Structure formats: C-alpha cells, structure tokens
Amino acid sequence: VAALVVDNGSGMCKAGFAGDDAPRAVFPSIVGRPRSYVGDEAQSKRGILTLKYPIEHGIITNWDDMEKIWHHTFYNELRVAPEEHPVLLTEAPLNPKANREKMTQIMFETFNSPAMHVAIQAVLSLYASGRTTGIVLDSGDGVSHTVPIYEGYALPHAILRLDLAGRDLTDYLMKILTERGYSFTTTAEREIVRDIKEKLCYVALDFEQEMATAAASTSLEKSYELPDGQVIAIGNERFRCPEALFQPSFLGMESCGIHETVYNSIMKCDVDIRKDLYANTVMSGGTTMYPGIADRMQKEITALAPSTIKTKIIAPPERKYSVWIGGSILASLSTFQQMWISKEEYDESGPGIVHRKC
Amino acid sequence: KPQTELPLGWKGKPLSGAPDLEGMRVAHISIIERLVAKIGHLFAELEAYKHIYKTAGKHPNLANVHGMAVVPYGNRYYYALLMDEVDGWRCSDTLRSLADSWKQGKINSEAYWGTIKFIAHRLLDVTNHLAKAGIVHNDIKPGNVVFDRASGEPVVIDLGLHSRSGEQPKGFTESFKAPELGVGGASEKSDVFLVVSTLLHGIEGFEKDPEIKPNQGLRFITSEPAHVMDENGYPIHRPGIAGVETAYTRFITDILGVSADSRPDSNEARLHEFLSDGTIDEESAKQILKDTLTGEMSPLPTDVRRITPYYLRELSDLLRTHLSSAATKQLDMGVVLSDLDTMLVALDKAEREGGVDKDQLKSFNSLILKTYSVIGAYILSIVEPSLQRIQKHLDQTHSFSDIGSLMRAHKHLETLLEVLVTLSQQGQPVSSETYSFLNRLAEAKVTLSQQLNTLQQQQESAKAQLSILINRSGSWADVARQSLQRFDSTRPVVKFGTEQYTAIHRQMMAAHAAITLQEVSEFTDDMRNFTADSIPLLIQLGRSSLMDEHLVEQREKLRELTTIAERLNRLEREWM
Ligand SMILES: Nc1ncnc2c1ncn2[C@@H]1O[C@H](COP(=O)(O)OP(=O)(O)OP(=O)(O)O)[C@@H](O)[C@H]1O
Numbered sequence: 061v062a063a064l065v066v067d068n069g070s071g072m073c074k075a076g077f078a079g080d081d082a083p084r085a086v087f088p089s090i091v092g093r094p095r096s097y098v099g100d101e102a103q104s105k106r107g108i109l110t111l112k113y114p115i116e117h118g119i120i121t122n123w124d125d126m127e128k129i130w131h132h133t134f135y136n137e138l139r140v141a142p143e144e145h146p147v148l149l150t151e152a153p154l155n156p157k158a159n160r161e162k163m164t165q166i167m168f169e170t171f172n173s174p175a176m177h178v179a180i181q182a183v184l185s186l187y188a189s190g191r192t193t194g195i196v197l198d199s200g201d202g203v204s205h206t207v208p209i210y211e212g213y214a215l216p217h218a219i220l221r222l223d224l225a226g227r228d229l230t231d232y233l234m235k236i237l238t239e240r241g242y243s244f245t246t247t248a249e250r251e252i253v254r255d256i257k258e259k260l261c262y263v264a265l266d267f268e269q270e271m272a273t274a275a276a277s278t279s280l281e282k283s284y285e286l287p288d289g290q291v292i293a294i295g296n297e298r299f300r301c302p303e304a305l306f307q308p309s310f311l312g313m314e315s316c317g318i319h320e321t322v323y324n325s326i327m328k329c330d331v332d333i334r335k336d337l338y339a340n341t342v343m344s345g346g347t348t349m350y351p352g353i354a355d356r357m358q359k360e361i362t363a364l365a366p367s368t369i370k371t372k373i374i375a376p377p378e379r380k381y382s383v384w385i386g387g388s389i390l391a392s393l394s395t396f397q398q399m400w401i402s403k404e405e406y407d408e409s410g411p412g413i414v415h416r417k418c
Numbered sequence: 419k420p421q422t423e424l425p426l427g428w429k430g431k432p433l434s435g436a437p438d439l440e441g442m443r444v445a446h447i448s449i450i451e452r453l454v455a456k457i458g459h460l461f462a463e464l465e466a467y468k469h470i471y472k473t474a475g476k477h478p479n480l481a482n483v484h485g486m487a488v489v490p491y492g493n494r495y496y497y498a499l500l501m502d503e504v505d506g507w508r509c510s511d512t513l514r515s516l517a518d519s520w521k522q523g524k525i526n527s528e529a530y531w532g533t534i535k536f537i538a539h540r541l542l543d544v545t546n547h548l549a550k551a552g553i554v555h556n557d558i559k560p561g562n563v564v565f566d567r568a569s570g571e572p573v574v575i576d577l578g579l580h581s582r583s584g585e586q587p588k589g590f591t592e593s594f595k596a597p598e599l600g601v602g603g604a605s606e607k608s609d610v611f612l613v614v615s616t617l618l619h620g621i622e623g624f625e626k627d628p629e630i631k632p633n634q635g636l637r638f639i640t641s642e643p644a645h646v647m648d649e650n651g652y653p654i655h656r657p658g659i660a661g662v663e664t665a666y667t668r669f670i671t672d673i674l675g676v677s678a679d680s681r682p683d684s685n686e687a688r689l690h691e692f693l694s695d696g697t698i699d700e701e702s703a704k705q706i707l708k709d710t711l712t713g714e715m716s717p718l719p720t721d722v723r724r725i726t727p728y729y730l731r732e733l734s735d736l737l738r739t740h741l742s743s744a745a746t747k748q749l750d751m752g753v754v755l756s757d758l759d760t761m762l763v764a765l766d767k768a769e770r771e772g773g774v775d776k777d778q779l780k781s782f783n784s785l786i787l788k789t790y791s792v793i794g795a796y797i798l799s800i801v802e803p804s805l806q807r808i809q810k811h812l813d814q815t816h817s818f819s820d821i822g823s824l825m826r827a828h829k830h831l832e833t834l835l836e837v838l839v840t841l842s843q844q845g846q847p848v849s850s851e852t853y854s855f856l857n858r859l860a861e862a863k864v865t866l867s868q869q870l871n872t873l874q875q876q877q878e879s880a881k882a883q884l885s886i887l888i889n890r891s892g893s894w895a896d897v898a899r900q901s902l903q904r905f906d907s908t909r910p911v912v913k914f915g916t917e918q919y920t921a922i923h924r925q926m927m928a929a930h931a932a933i934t935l936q937e938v939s940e941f942t943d944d945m946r947n948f949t950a951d952s953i954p955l956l957i958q959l960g961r962s963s964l965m966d967e968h969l970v971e972q973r974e975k976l977r978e979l980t981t982i983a984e985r986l987n988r989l990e991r992e993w994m
C-alpha cells in the first residue's frame with residue numbers, strides 16, 4: 061500500500077502519496093476555534109472563528125491544533141485511513157527533541173499508524189536535486205534556513221535560522237501599498253495581497269537601477285484585478301517587496317540578507333568542503349520562487365566569495381514542493397523501508413525511539 | 419504663601435473611594451499631588467459621571483471622577499472636578515507615534531491595524547456604556563482621548579458637552595461632528611460618528627492637511643494616482659484619499675457617509691467587516707501601545723503642509739498686511755523679512771512638488787518682489803537664520819530644479835544686504851557685528867553665482883542631448899505608439915484566481931503581446947539603446963518645474979517616448 065507523505069509548514073500543508081510528482085492536497089495550516097475548522101473552510105467561516113497557526117517559524121507550538129490539521133489531512137484532504145498507511149513526516153532544522161517525541165506519540169497513539177519516519181525538510185530538498193552534498197536555502201512563509209549538507213549529513217554547527225519569510229513580505233507589501241491609497245487590513249485582504257505578491261513581484265538584478273527606472277517613467281507599473289472587480293496599479297513595490305530578502309532593514313530587522321546568510325553558513329564549514337557547497341547551492345520553498353532571485357543570488361554570493369570559487373545556483377521550477385517531492389522519493393525507495401519506525405517498535409521503546417531511528 | 423502650599427477642600431459629598439485632600443497640593447486643567455482638577459456646566463458634568471456610575475457602572479476606558487472640590491488657582495479659589503490622572507499621551511500624539519513606528523518598521527502591519535481595531539472596540543464600548551445610562555457624549559475627539567502608559571488603554575476624559583438621549587447637545591466640535599448633531603436631538607448614533615471621525619483623523623493624518631475635515635470621510639480617486647510622489651520615486655499617502663474600496667473604506671462609508679437612521683450603533687459597528695476581520699489579542703494590542711507610550715513621541719509635524727491654491731492665497735494675505743502697514747507707517751521691519759523667508763521656502767517646496775498652477779506661482783513670486791520694492795521705498799538677529807538656511811542650501815547637491823531657487827535666494831541676500839547698509843545711512847551706524855555679517859552675505863552671493871552659472875551650463879548641455887535623443891525616436895516613435903495603444907486597448911491586467919481560472923485569459927494577452935512585439939520587431943534594438951540613454955537623462959532633468967518651459971515640454975516628450983520604448987522592451991517578460 062502507498063506510504064503517506066505529509067509536509068507541515070508555517071503557512072501551507074502539503075500531503076499526498078509516495079510515488080507521485082506533486083502533493084494531491086495543499087491547504088493553509090490554519091485552525092479555527094469558535095468565538096472547529098481547518099484550512100480553507102476555516103478561512104471561509106472566519107466570521108465566527110478565531111484563526112491560529114500551529115506552526116511558528118517552522119516549529120510546532122500548538123500540539124492540540126496540530127492534531128486537528130493531521131486529522132483534517134487524513135480524513136478530509138487525503139481521505140484515507142492512517143492505520144493502513146505508513147507515514148513520512150517532515151521537521152524543521154534544529155527541531156527540539158521534545159517536539160520529535162511528541163510528534164511520534166501522536167502518530168502512534170492517536171492515529172494508530174503502522175509505521176512512521178520524520179526527516180529534515182532541507183535535506184529532502186537536496187535529495188530532490190539528486191544531491192547528497194550541498195547547501196540549501198529553504199525559505200517559506202514563516203522561517204528561512206541555510207543548511208549545509210555533506211555526504212548526506214547536515215552540519216548542525218553551520219546551520220543558520222533567519223526569521224524572515226513570506227508572511228513578512230506580504231505584511232511589508234501591505235504597508236507600502238497604503239502609500240498608494242490602498243488600505244488592506246483584514247485577513248481576507250492579507251490573502252489577496254499575498255496573491256498580488258506571488259504574481260506581480262520580482263527580484264531586481266540591480267535595485268538602485270530599477271528604482272531609477274520606476275521614478276523616471278511609468279514603464280514598470282502593472283495592474284491587478286481584485287475579486288470584486290476593482291483594479292489597482294502598483295509600481296516599484298513589485299521589486300521593493302522581495303528586496304527585503306536581501307535588505308532586512310526594510311522590515312526593521314538588523315540581520316543579514318539571505319545571500320549573506322548562505323555565505324556565513326558556508327564559511328562556518330571546513331575549508332576543504334566550501335567549494336562543493338558553493339557549486340551546489342540549492343533553493344527551496346515558496347519564498348524562493350520570485351522571478352530573478354536566482355540571478356541576484358548568483359550575483360550577491362559571487363561578490364562575497366573569493367574569486368577562484370565557482371558559484372552555481374540550482375532553482376527547480378516548482379521548488380515550493382521540493383521538500384514534499386524529496387519525501388515522496390525517499391518513501392518510495394524499498395531500500396528505505398528498513399528505516400520506518402514500526403508500531404511494534406514504538407510499543408517496545410516508546411516515543412524516545414525517534415532519536416535512534418530518525 | 420504661594421498657591422502650591424494652599425490646601426484643597428470638598429464642595430459636596432465626594433464619591434466612595436475618594437482620597438483624603440489633606441496632603442494634596444497644586445503643582446482648563448491643573449495637576450494635583452496623582453489627581454486632576456477641571457476648573458454651571460461643570461456641576462452638570464459631575465452629575466453625568468455619577469449617573470453613569472450608578473446605571474451602567476464604572477469603566478476602565480472612562481474617566482474616574484472623585485467629586486467636586488475647591489482648589490487654589492489664579493489668586494482665587496475655584497470649583498474643580500476631581501479625577502484620577504491618566505498618565506500617558508493624548509490620542510493625536512499616540513496615533514501619530516503608532517503610525518510612525520509602523521512606517522519605520524518597528525512594528526509590522528498586523529500589529530498596527532490590530533491595535534487600531536483594538537482602540538476602535540474600546541471607544542465603541544464606551545459609547546455603548548454611556549448609551550446604557552441614556553447619556554450622549556457629543557464631543558468625542560483626539561483631544562478628549564488619553565492613553566494610559568501603564569496599561570496601554572485609551573481613556574475618554576471629558577463630559578462637559580454631554581446631554582441626555584433626545585435633547586439638544588450642550589455643544590460640539592464642528593470639525594468632527596455628525597451632520598445632524600446640533601441641528602433641529604443628540605443620539606448614540608452621533609457618538610458612533612464621532613468615534614470613527616476621531617479614528618479617521620489619526621489614521622489618515624488629518625493634522626497635516628487643515629483644509630479637510632474628518633467628518634467629510636474619504637475621497638475616492640480611482641482612475642488617477644490617489645497619492646503623491648517624492649524625490650526618489652516613492653509614493654506618499656494623501657490624507658483623506660483612498661485609491662481602492664476596502665473594509666477600512668467601507669467602515670468609514672457605512673458610518674460617516676450615512677444618515678443617523680441607517681447608521682449602525684456601537685454594538686453593530688463592532689460587528690463590521692473592518693472590526694471583525696484582522697483583529698489581534700487584546701494583550702498584544704495593549705503591549706504595543708505600552709511600548710509606544712514608553713518610547714519617543716513623534717512630534718507635531720511643522721511645515722509639512724503641501725502648498726495648495728488655498729494655502730498660497732493665505733501666504734499672499736500675510737504679505738498684503740505688510741504692504742498695508744507700510745502705507746500707514748506701522749510696518750514691522752523685523753517680521754516682514756522673516757515672513758518673506760518662509761515665502762521662499764514655500765515657493766521652493768511648491769516648485770519641486772506639484773498642485774498649484776504656474777500662473778499662481780509667478781503671481782506669488784511677483785508679490786514677493788513687490789514687497790521688496792515697498793520695503794526699499796520705506797527707507798540682525800532676525801535675518802541671521804535666513805542666511806544660515808541659505809548657506810545650508812549651498813552645501814547640498816543641486817539639480818536643474820534648484821536654479822529658480824538659487825536666483826531668488828540671491829535676490830533675498832541682496833535685499834538683506836541693502837536693508838542693513840541703508841539703515842546705517844540715517845540711523846544706527848554699521849557695527850562690528852553687522853559688518854562681518856555683510857561680508858558673510860557677500861561671500862554667499864559669490865558662491866551663489868558661481869554655482870548658478872554651472873547649473874545653467876549643464877542645463878544647456880542636457881538640453882542639447884535631449885534634442886539629439888528625440889531625433890533618433892523619429893523612426894519608431896509613432897509606429898510603436900500605435901501598436902502599444904492597440905495593445906493597451908485590450909486592457910491588460912493580472913487577474914485574481916487560480917492558473918486554471920486565468921489560463922484562457924492569460925494566453926489571450928500573450929497572443930496580443932506577441933502581435934504587438936512583431937509590429938515593432940525592427941526597432942527592438944533602437945528602443946533598447948534609446949532607454950539606456952534616455953532614463954539617465956530623465957533622472958538628471960527630474961520631474962520638478964523648470965524655468966525653461968520649452969525644456970519642460972521637451973522633457974515630457976522624452977518621458978512619453980521612454981515610456982513607450984521601455985514597456986515594449988519589457989512586454990515579453992510581462993505578458994508572455
Ligand atoms: N510564486 C510565488 N512567488 C512568491 N512567493 C510565493 C510563491 N508561491 C508561494 N509563495 C510564498 O511561499 C510561502 C509558503 O511557501 P512554503 O509552503 O514553501 O513555506 P511553509 O512551509 O508554509 O513555511 P515554513 O517553511 O516557514 O514552514 C507563502 O508565504 C507564499 O506567499
């Protein structure tokens with residue numbers, strides 16, 4: 061029977077069956093309590109609910125709400141029986157061991173899964189590239205990670221976390237759109253702004269040059285049609301928004317941009333393996349999906365790295381699903397069916413087994 | 419004994435919980451050692467609080483009144499309304515600082531609007547609370563709302579213009595009031611109006627535009643830019659102007675733009691889309707206000723006002739009073755030179771920005787020259803800041819936009835110099851300080867002329883390259899213009915929805931963009947090279963008004979040509 065692959069993120073949840081190209085179910089990681097619904101229906105019925113995010117910066121902070129998402133994933137989205145399918149879950153880098161054991165307990169004692177396994181998200185993205193060595197820039201809705209991986213092993217001492225991602229950019233776009241007389245405030249409108257962000261934004265190769273072009277003429281202006289029919293028009297906000305990824309000062313943060321964070325991760329690894337990382341910089345997540353981000357990433361790292369170093373950036377066409385695809389591949393291997401934590405193994409060892417097998 | 423050591427006393431029977439007046443001393447409204455005294459309508463106000471307290475109860479967002487007292491003030495003794503002090507900032511100062519920290523990225527957009535909606539829920543809870551006691555406030559405004567630092571809570575602190583439900587209001591503020599308030603009585607639905615107009619005041623920043631009134635709601639500019647541009651191309655929000663209809667604008671429209679009958683009450687307004695969707699936890703909102711009030715206050719913006727035909731006329735009226743006073747030999751020589759300096763600052767600001775017609779600008783400029791003539795025909799500490807302002811204008815990077823500015827500055831320094839030495843002829847002789855000042859003026863005049871010559875030389879050069887560039891366009895200009903117009907007639911726009919839902923629509927645009935790009939396929943390299951030269955030139959020419967109006971007309975000719983060329987250069991990436 062087909063193993064299940066579930067990728068839990070800060071903003072979106074991806075679920076499907078191992079051996080498929082894309083996740084069959086992709087829904088918002090939102091749980092709505094009165095004053096209970098999950099995902100899209102929680103959004104559509106927001107008028108009588110209080111929406112919460114179980115995942116914060118890639119880390120589970122609400123286990124009760126995390127259960128409802130998994131329950132929704134199994135019985136409503138995938139519409140399968142958890143007790144009849146092995147399940148592959150995903151986890152953020154440097155995920156606390158208490159979170160790992162709790163995740164294990166829930167799959168076995170609540171959903172009664174025959175077998176389970178949990179893998180690091182960035183590592184799965186590297187596998188989907190067909191690589192065992194390289195550094196991954198994973199950037200989603202809530203968190204950004206730079207994860208150096210060598211010969212299948214992640215290097216924990218060189219991993220960097222950057223609390224800068226999609227929802228920050230969407231929030232930023234909301235602010236700077238008010239300067240054009242566009243006042244989006246509600247959660248519904250926040251989703252619409254997110255839609256605008258995903259369709260009109262792009263990363264400028266030369267920021268100051270594009271600003272000059274935007275100020276000199278109306279050539280960079282593009283129009284967007286709201287669901288109610290209203291048409292808005294935006295200009296330099298198109299490339300000012302994702303520029304925050306490289307200039308966190310735009311968001312009020314005194315931290316390094318993604319390009320400099322990747323560099324610092326590489327520079328914390330051993331000298332003799334930095335070359336291999338530079339040549340295999342892989343990008344993952346929906347936030348990395350901006351047009352032109354790869355070229356800009358290429359440019360910025362080249363400026364930081366020594367001259368002799370070759371810099372190559374791998375950016376898969378739908379790297380928003382790379383983590384899931386990497387999971388689907390891993391769970392499809394019959395050489396991997398040796399790694400699952402069986403229900404028998406759990407009943408013998410308990411939650412603490414996840415540290416030994418995963 | 420000063421009044422800071424004179425004791426206080428009670429007038430009537432103080433409310434339960436009132437403090438002992440024995441140890442209290444004094445430092446409108448005065449502060450007592452913390453308590454606050456408000457010095458007929460005052461006794462009726464105390465009665466209003468008592469009625470609210472016994473019918474609806476006390477409220478955290480309503481003032482805490484102790485009773486009526488006699489206080490030592492102004493070589494007399496006054497009846498004073500005693501109340502707990504709300505230690506913090508007033509509503510105008512708080513909302514300005516809140517928006518300021520937002521723009522500076524100290525807080526994000528969900529924190530800002532969450533707090534705004536939190537403040538709204540509190541104020542509407544107050545108006546609901548007063549409605550329980552059958553009392554209408556009639557004067558809710560930023561001045562009557564104070565935020566508490568310790569709790570981050572908004573507190574309304576005045577009831578002097580209150581009235582019972584159905585009777586005529588004791589008074590109102592004309593700038594915030596509802597259409598029906600004070601005409602024909604008062605109502606809860608008039609207080610709800612005030613709550614929103616008060617919030618609208620601090621959200622839009624009406625304090626930067628005295629020509630508009632909060633009770634007028636929002637203007638809708640949809641077919642044109644609902645904003646203004648700054649120096650480097652950043653759009654700037656226009657107070658009271660909306661570019662698109664949202665939950666925020668509906669909230670204003672559904673309340674400030676309807677009759678009392680159709681207007682929602684306090685409880686209804688809190689169920690509105692704007693106040694229902696996009697809220698945050700109360701403690702998170704309270705925490706944000708705490709952090710704001712414990713931080714640095716954003717000051718009341720001075721000289722931020724845009725130069726409009728109204729304001730330009732106001733400045734003109736100020737100059738004419740000086741002309742009139744000169745005819746009646748009571749001209750204040752000191753304040754007329756300082757006022758003229760603000761005129762130049764206003765005129766410069768009006769040139770770089772837009773709005774006011776050029777006919778009014780030349781007229782305003784002539785009025786300044788006229789005032790100079792009257793001053794001259796009429797025959798240091800005040801003219802000193804004028805030189806300092808101009809000297810700092812000389813140490814900055816200049817543009818072609820600054821030429822008209824530097825000319826008038828030269829005229830001003832020249833007039834200042836003449837005035838000083840002319841007064842020495844039949845008045846006080848030139849002193850050692852005036853003399854050194856004359857040479858400081860003279861040195862600035864020299865630097866002014868040196869810099870002004872350079873700019874006009876550079877302008878003639880730029881004007882030469884401008885004509886050269888327009889010449890190259892002649893081979894593709896009109897053809898490319900017709901093609902892009904035919905493309906823009908199809909109304910290109912990115913649609914909301916899934917890729918499936920927009921598939922047919924998007925591939926229709928790619929086809930249209932393809933056709934357009936085939937009609938100009940022979941100029942694709944000329945247009946690419948054209949913008950590589952024209953854009954840097956457009957930056958050097960700017961968007962501000964220039965003295966050479968032919969240059970301005972030609973500059974816009976290039977701007978339109980550049981717009982056509984650059985869009986076609988990007989058309990494939992935008993729609994294909
Ligand atoms: N084409 C696109 N352009 C820009 N942003 C996009 C695009 N597609 C998706 N996104 C953004 O990616 C984010 C979600 O991506 P993803 O599911 O990879 O992250 P996540 O797992 O939800 O977040 P995290 O990795 O922090 O847990 C959303 O904020 C969304 O706005």
Ligand SMILES: [Ca+2]
Nearest residue numbers: 069070181200
């Ligand atoms: Ca993720």
